[PDB]
Scaffold this motif. Structure first.
Motif, mmCIF file in Angstrom:
data_model
loop_
_atom_site.group_PDB
_atom_site.id
_atom_site.type_symbol
_atom_site.label_atom_id
_atom_site.label_comp_id
_atom_site.label_asym_id
_atom_site.label_seq_id
_atom_site.Cartn_x
_atom_site.Cartn_y
_atom_site.Cartn_z
ATOM 1 N N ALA F 256 -10.525 -1.056 10.880
ATOM 2 C CA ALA F 256 -9.901 -2.343 10.592
ATOM 3 C C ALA F 256 -8.625 -2.182 9.774
ATOM 4 O O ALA F 256 -7.747 -3.043 9.805
ATOM 5 C CB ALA F 256 -10.878 -3.259 9.875
ATOM 6 N N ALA F 257 -8.528 -1.078 9.040
ATOM 7 C CA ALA F 257 -7.383 -0.832 8.171
ATOM 8 C C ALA F 257 -6.300 -0.014 8.868
ATOM 9 O O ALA F 257 -5.292 0.344 8.260
ATOM 10 C CB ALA F 257 -7.827 -0.139 6.895
ATOM 11 N N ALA F 266 -4.633 -6.294 7.006
ATOM 12 C CA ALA F 266 -3.447 -6.755 6.297
ATOM 13 C C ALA F 266 -2.790 -7.955 6.974
ATOM 14 O O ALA F 266 -2.272 -8.848 6.301
ATOM 15 C CB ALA F 266 -2.454 -5.625 6.142
ATOM 16 N N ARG F 267 -2.811 -7.971 8.304
ATOM 17 C CA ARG F 267 -2.231 -9.082 9.053
ATOM 18 C C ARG F 267 -3.047 -10.352 8.843
ATOM 19 O O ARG F 267 -2.488 -11.445 8.745
ATOM 20 C CB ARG F 267 -2.129 -8.762 10.547
ATOM 21 N N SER F 268 -4.367 -10.200 8.784
ATOM 22 C CA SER F 268 -5.257 -11.319 8.496
ATOM 23 C C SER F 268 -4.867 -11.932 7.159
ATOM 24 O O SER F 268 -4.741 -13.149 7.033
ATOM 25 C CB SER F 268 -6.716 -10.860 8.455
ATOM 26 N N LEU F 269 -4.663 -11.075 6.166
ATOM 27 C CA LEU F 269 -4.193 -11.509 4.858
ATOM 28 C C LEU F 269 -2.786 -12.120 4.933
ATOM 29 O O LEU F 269 -2.548 -13.213 4.415
ATOM 30 C CB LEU F 269 -4.210 -10.335 3.877
ATOM 31 N N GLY F 273 -0.199 -15.467 3.840
ATOM 32 C CA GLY F 273 0.793 -15.123 2.839
ATOM 33 C C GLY F 273 0.138 -14.341 1.718
ATOM 34 O O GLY F 273 0.584 -14.370 0.570
ATOM 35 N N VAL F 274 -0.934 -13.641 2.067
ATOM 36 C CA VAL F 274 -1.706 -12.856 1.116
ATOM 37 C C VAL F 274 -1.461 -11.365 1.343
ATOM 38 O O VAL F 274 -1.368 -10.913 2.484
ATOM 39 C CB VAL F 274 -3.212 -13.195 1.232
ATOM 40 N N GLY F 275 -1.328 -10.615 0.252
ATOM 41 C CA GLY F 275 -1.100 -9.184 0.331
ATOM 42 C C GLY F 275 -2.371 -8.361 0.242
ATOM 43 O O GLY F 275 -3.464 -8.900 0.057
ATOM 44 N N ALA F 276 -2.224 -7.045 0.377
ATOM 45 C CA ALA F 276 -3.351 -6.120 0.296
ATOM 46 C C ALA F 276 -3.912 -6.042 -1.120
ATOM 47 O O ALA F 276 -5.100 -5.783 -1.316
ATOM 48 C CB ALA F 276 -2.931 -4.736 0.775
ATOM 49 N N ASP F 277 -3.049 -6.266 -2.104
ATOM 50 C CA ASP F 277 -3.452 -6.241 -3.504
ATOM 51 C C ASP F 277 -4.292 -7.460 -3.849
ATOM 52 O O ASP F 277 -4.976 -7.491 -4.872
ATOM 53 C CB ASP F 277 -2.222 -6.194 -4.411
ATOM 54 N N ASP F 278 -4.240 -8.462 -2.980
ATOM 55 C CA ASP F 278 -4.863 -9.750 -3.253
ATOM 56 C C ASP F 278 -6.337 -9.814 -2.862
ATOM 57 O O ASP F 278 -6.969 -10.866 -2.976
ATOM 58 C CB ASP F 278 -4.058 -10.880 -2.612
ATOM 59 N N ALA F 304 -8.230 1.031 1.528
ATOM 60 C CA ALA F 304 -7.263 0.555 0.549
ATOM 61 C C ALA F 304 -6.091 1.524 0.423
ATOM 62 O O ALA F 304 -4.940 1.109 0.299
ATOM 63 C CB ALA F 304 -7.933 0.351 -0.802
ATOM 64 N N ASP F 305 -6.395 2.817 0.466
ATOM 65 C CA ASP F 305 -5.394 3.857 0.250
ATOM 66 C C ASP F 305 -4.257 3.830 1.271
ATOM 67 O O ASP F 305 -3.087 3.937 0.906
ATOM 68 C CB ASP F 305 -6.056 5.238 0.233
ATOM 69 N N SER F 306 -4.601 3.685 2.546
ATOM 70 C CA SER F 306 -3.600 3.710 3.611
ATOM 71 C C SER F 306 -2.834 2.402 3.776
ATOM 72 O O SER F 306 -1.714 2.395 4.287
ATOM 73 C CB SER F 306 -4.232 4.119 4.941
ATOM 74 N N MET F 307 -3.434 1.297 3.344
ATOM 75 C CA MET F 307 -2.800 -0.008 3.493
ATOM 76 C C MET F 307 -1.805 -0.271 2.367
ATOM 77 O O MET F 307 -1.171 -1.324 2.319
ATOM 78 C CB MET F 307 -3.843 -1.126 3.562
ATOM 79 N N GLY F 308 -1.671 0.696 1.466
ATOM 80 C CA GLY F 308 -0.716 0.590 0.384
ATOM 81 C C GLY F 308 -1.209 -0.250 -0.774
ATOM 82 O O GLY F 308 -0.432 -0.973 -1.397
#
Lengths: 48, 145, 193, 48, 48, 434, 193
Positions: F256-257, F266-269, F273-278, F304-308
């Protein structure tokens, strides 16, 4: 066993019963885990 | 002097009758800043959760969430669990109220915590397996050779 | 703090402390030892989770780098415990993973030893009056065997390292008549020296 | 027709592509799942 | 008096009379010194 | 040939069980139903009723806004109907009088079939996933799938399973369950023996129960004017691959990542307008087994690691299995339920069963294990959770959950204000009904 | 199930099995160590519960069955798989292989055109794992030696899980509908979805 009890008393044999066993030990060597949770708790709760 | 001070007691008058109950559940909003466009997202293509419920070792979603987040039940927490566990019953017979189901005694909402919760905690959540099947896996499980 | 963390250093001390329980002198010593970057063996008479949770609270506060704490159920009144405990304290420091989980007894040569174990007078079984007789085993004789025990480990495993045993002497014997316990019992520590 | 006659069509795989080199592939296990376009070459007969 | 009480308990303004508080009120109507000026409930006793 | 009665002593003396004194009768289930149906049925039946009670009551009110064939039921099971199954195989071989409806009642789909007959009466889709331990999240995935294609506009997603005799002996034989005789030897009380990510984690506690959620089209929820508990930003099940080794756990949930900014996670987020950190919170499967915990951790660490994910912005993770125990079928729904409750209240539940974090997990820096509740007040909001569950036989799943207030931002200020009006009126009427 | 009217004649049993006997009856059963052989005698008194073998005649003498002589072995399934897995598993496993044979063979060829997480498995059951289920509930109550993997193998999803482990090795979706009689078409629906 009655004679031995007569000399020593009631409490002495009962309190001298074994307790320690090698399998119940617990070791905490992690600071790394506890330090991280410790900081975030400070950061969020900061008042003073 | 100090043993005597500890040995000499006294009673300061305390007249108190306490009860336990609450308003229907409310929601506390969170502060979130959002820069967004309206028409862009198709509502037909989105999936949204309307509601949900659960039946588990801690009771319904309301009581389970209380035990998970808090660790102790509120007034509504013990009231609901005592109801689900079947400690409290409702009779239309005279005196018209909540009654203890086991002993057949009238109960208010306050004493629910005092009279029950001690036994509730033991008999809810995780505990030794109570045998409703007349069989104990751990003790005796029927075998035929 | 991130900059001070990068250059942070550590010390090392290996200690065994008994009588470390809550609201005591030794508990203040334990957290301070942990504050000094030490390795501490902490014994508790009551193994209940309320005592277990306390040392976790005490550790997560006062622990520095290089700091490792050890909590165990222990009874200083039992000679078996003393022998079994130090046999655990002195063996390997090894963990064998076979088909099963076997932890070989952790070997750390004690620098400091703190026999602060302090039986209290609670007589529910009627034991009253015979306690001062029994505690003489605990406070001295069993300590002697405790000192002897760690002496064997040190000699067998051959260390020249001196274990420093702080002897919890009672203050100024003979000039107080009101203590009733401390003053008399600890005067034989001069004889132990 | 080659499968029907010989009893060939069922071969239970040793999973060569998973472990192919013991040291790196266990390390490469993470890297594979992480990056999108990493795939099998045909020429080595399906290598990961 | 009304304001004094329900200021202390502002939630009384937004919520329902508790299902167990309904029988209590109807019960109080029956034990009241001077008979109630209204009809609290439509039921078998409505004539009374 | 004679079969002579004997006995056996077994290892598991403890399980996570529905509070003693529970009755479907107290909830109002008729005695005829209680008899005719399996125990597992009573769980999904009452749960469905209480699930509706969150918004509407009368199931036919759905037929006001919607044609009945657009009502769907997606309900997962690991096994389901266990009692009714063990009732036949005993009973028949024992010639005891047993019910004639047995095989009908052992079909894992028959339980919600009973609910559709008794309650909703929908004319539309019925699906019944088997995800082993992952059915719940696997069910949500298909519930989501049914809506977006216009097959049905209203779905019920969930999972349920029961704890019986031979459920226990299957796990204990498989070695996957924690051995109670060993737990008591280590001085572990029954409440403390389910510990996720702990150094001492001995394997999972088996549980019983069921739970369900009502998933709907966002447009319909506004139109019906029901409560919005959360937005499901994504749902997926994932397999693992070919291998011989039995302890080797499935890592395939990482799919999924894949792609980073182009990734499904990440696209779902990003669409909100939501980021990976969110993503603050991940709800782990957290089986407390030695196999699952570090693997699921490595998995969440890598996604988490690869999605930045910003370095050291760790996902705060809750383990509900330490409390509720592990119910196979209804696992990820209880986590699904908890995650919604996390989003709205902001509160991140602790793992109170954690004495010490496993020293192996130190290698994961994007993961934080919290032993005490971090309660988020009005000044401290949160955004998006993730439910992850690993079933048996490479069944893995991921459900991205996002706060309701992200959806209200797409209505424009006039309609946004108009919706809050309707939702407010519903809550008051909802509190009434409840 | 029948109640024994008068005490049954003693039978020889092991200590482990005989102690178990006591755990059911205990007022109604009697067990003793035999000093010489160390084993135990098991004597059931009056009032015990006994399960006595009988038979039944049934209505259905005919079914539609896979042609006699079918073997998963002939298709090339290894004996280890045949043992460990339910009969229902052998059906879905071979069918999947022959299903692929319609187009491609090597399941990893899919990973050439597609990222493995984009491979899905939607496989329905009305019950599934029936044999493995009836194997546990007999076996356990009968104490017969039965496999330890039973509950894993009774999960209606485990059958294609076995196929994904043995063959395709996909990293992607797995769904397992229960449609009673309709699972097949219900499965297609979700496969489409």
């Amino acid at each position: 066993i009655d004679l031995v009890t007569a000399e020593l008393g009631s409490d002495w044999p009962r309190l001298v019963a074994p307790t320690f066993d090698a399998r119940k030990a617990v070791v905490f060597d992690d600071r790394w885990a506890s330090a991280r949770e410790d900081l975030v708790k400070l950061w969020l709760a900061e008042e003073x | 002097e100090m043993s005597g001070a500890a040995d000499x007691x006294x009673x300061x008058x305390x007249x108190x009758x306490x009860x336990x109950x609450x308003x229907x559940x409310x929601x506390x909003x969170x502060x979130x800043x959002x820069x967004x466009x309206x028409x862009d997202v198709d509502p037909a293509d989105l999936v949204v959760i309307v509601g949900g419920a659960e039946l588990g070792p801690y009771g319904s979603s309301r009581t389970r969430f209380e035990m998970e987040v808090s660790g102790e039940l509120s007034a509504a927490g013990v009231l609901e669990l005592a109801w689900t566990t079947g400690m409290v019953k409702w009779e239309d017979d005279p005196k018209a109220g909540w009654y203890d189901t086991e002993t057949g005694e009238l109960v208010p909402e306050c004493e629910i915590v005092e009279r029950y919760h001690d036994a509730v905690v033991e008999r809810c959540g995780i505990r030794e397996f109570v045998d409703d099947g007349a069989i104990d896996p751990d003790h005796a499980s029927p075998l035929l050779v | 703090x991130x900059x001070x963390x990068x250059x942070x250093x550590x010390x090392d001390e290996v200690a065994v402390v008994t009588g470390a329980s809550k609201g005591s002198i030794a508990a203040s010593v334990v957290g301070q030892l942990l504050d000094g970057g030490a390795t501490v063996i902490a014994t508790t008479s009551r193994l209940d989770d309320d005592r277990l949770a306390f040392y976790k609270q005490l550790y997560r506060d006062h622990a520095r780098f290089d700091a490792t704490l050890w909590v165990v159920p222990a009874n200083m009144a039992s000679y078996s415990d003393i022998d079994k405990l130090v046999e655990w304290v002195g063996t390997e420091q090894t963990e064998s993973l076979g088909p099963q989980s076997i932890h070989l007894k952790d070997a750390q040569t004690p620098t400091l030893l703190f026999p602060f174990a302090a039986p209290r007078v609670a007589g529910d079984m009627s034991e009253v009056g015979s306690r001062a007789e029994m505690e003489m085993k605990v406070l001295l004789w069993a300590v002697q065997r405790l000192i002897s025990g760690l002496s064997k480990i040190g000699a067998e495993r051959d260390i020249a390292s001196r274990l420093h045993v702080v002897l919890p002497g009672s203050p100024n014997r003979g000039m107080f008549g009101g203590d009733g316990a401390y003053g008399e019992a600890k005067s034989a520590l001069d004889a132990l020296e | 027709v080659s499968a029907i006659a010989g009893g060939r069509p069922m071969y239970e795989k040793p999973a060569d592509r998973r472990f192919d080199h013991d040291v790196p592939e266990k390390r490469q296990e993470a890297a594979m799942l992480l990056s999108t376009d990493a795939r099998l070459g045909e020429n080595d007969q399906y290598v990961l | 008096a009304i304001t004094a009480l329900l200021q202390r308990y502002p939630d009384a303004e937004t919520v329902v009379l508790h299902p167990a508080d309904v029988p209590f009120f109807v019960e109080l109507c029956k034990t009241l010194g001077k008979p109630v000026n209204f009809v609290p409930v439509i039921d078998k006793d409505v004539r009374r | 040939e004679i079969r002579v009665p004997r006995k056996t002593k077994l290892s598991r003396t403890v399980g996570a069980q529905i509070p003693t004194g529970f009755d479907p009768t107290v909830w109002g289930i008729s005695p005829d139903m209680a008899s005719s149906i399996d125990r597992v049925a009573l769980w999904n039946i009452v749960a469905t009723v209480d699930a509706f009670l969150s918004s509407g009551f009368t199931p036919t009110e759905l037929m006001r806004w919607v044609h009945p064939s657009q009502v769907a039921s997606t309900q997962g099971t690991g096994m389901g109907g266990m009692t009714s199954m063990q009732t036949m195989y005993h009973g028949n071989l024992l010639g005891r009088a047993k019910p004639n409806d047995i095989l009908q009642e052992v079909l894992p789909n028959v339980v919600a079939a009973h609910v559709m007959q008794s309650y909703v009466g929908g004319y539309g889709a019925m699906v019944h996933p088997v995800g082993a331990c992952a059915t719940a999240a696997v069910s949500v995935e298909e519930g989501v799938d049914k809506i977006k294609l216009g097959k049905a506009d209203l779905v019920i997603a969930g999972g349920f399973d029961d704890l019986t005799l031979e459920a226990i002996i299957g796990f204990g034989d498989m070695a996957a369950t924690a051995d109670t005789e060993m737990m008591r030897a280590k001085g572990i009380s029954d409440s403390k023996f389910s510990r996720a990510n702990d150094r001492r984690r001995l394997g999972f506690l088996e549980a019983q129960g069921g739970g369900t959620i009502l998933l709907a089209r966002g447009d319909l929820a506004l139109k019906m004017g029901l409560p919005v508990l959360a937005v499901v930003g994504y749902a997926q099940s994932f397999a693992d691959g070919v291998h011989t080794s039995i302890p080797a756990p499935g890592l395939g949930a990482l799919g999924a990542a894949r792609g980073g900014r182009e990734s499904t996670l990440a696209r779902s987020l990003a669409q909100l307008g939501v980021g990976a950190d969110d993503i603050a919170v991940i709800s782990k499967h957290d089986t407390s087994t030695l196999a699952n915990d570090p693997n699921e951790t490595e998995l969440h660490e890598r996604i988490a690691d690869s999605m930045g994910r910003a370095p050291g912005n760790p996902l705060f993770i809750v383990s509900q299995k330490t409390l509720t125990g592990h119910a196979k079928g209804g696992a990820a729904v209880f986590q699904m339920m908890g995650l919604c409750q996390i989003l709205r209240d902001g509160v991140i539940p602790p793992n109170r069963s954690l004495d010490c974090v496993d020293d192996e997990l130190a290698t994961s820096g994007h993961f934080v294990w919290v032993r005490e509740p971090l309660d988020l007040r009005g000044k401290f909001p949160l955004k998006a959770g993730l439910v992850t569950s690993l079933g048996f036989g490479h069944v893995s799943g991921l459900v991205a959950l996002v706060h309701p207030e992200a959806f209200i931002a797409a209505l424009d200020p006039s309609e946004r204000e108009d919706y809050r009006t309707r939702a407010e009126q519903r809550m008051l009427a909802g509190q009434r009904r409840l | 199930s029948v109640f024994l009217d008068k005490d049954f004649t003693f039978v020889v049993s092991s200590e482990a099995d005989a102690r178990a006997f006591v755990q059911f009856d205990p007022e109604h059963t009697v067990a003793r160590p035999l000093p010489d052989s160390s084993d135990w005698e098991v004597t059931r008194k009056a009032g015990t519960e006994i399960r006595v073998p009988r038979k039944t005649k049934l209505s259905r003498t005919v079914g539609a069955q896979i042609p006699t002589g079918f073997d998963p072995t002939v298709w090339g399934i290894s004996p280890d798989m045949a043992s460990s897995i339910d009969r229902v598993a052998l059906w879905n496993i071979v069918a999947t292989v022959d299903a692929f044979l319609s187009s491609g063979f090597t399941p990893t060829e899919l990973m050439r055109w597609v990222h493995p997480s984009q491979v899905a498995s939607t496989q329905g059951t009305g019950m599934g794992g029936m044999t493995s289920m009836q194997t546990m509930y007999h076996g356990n109550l009968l104490g017969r030696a039965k496999p330890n993997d039973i509950l894993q193998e009774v999960l209606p999803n485990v059958v294609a899980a076995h196929v994904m482990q043995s063959y395709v090795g996909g990293y992607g979706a797995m769904v397992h509908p229960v449609g009673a009689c309709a699972t097949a078409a219900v499965s297609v629906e979700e496969g489409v979805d």
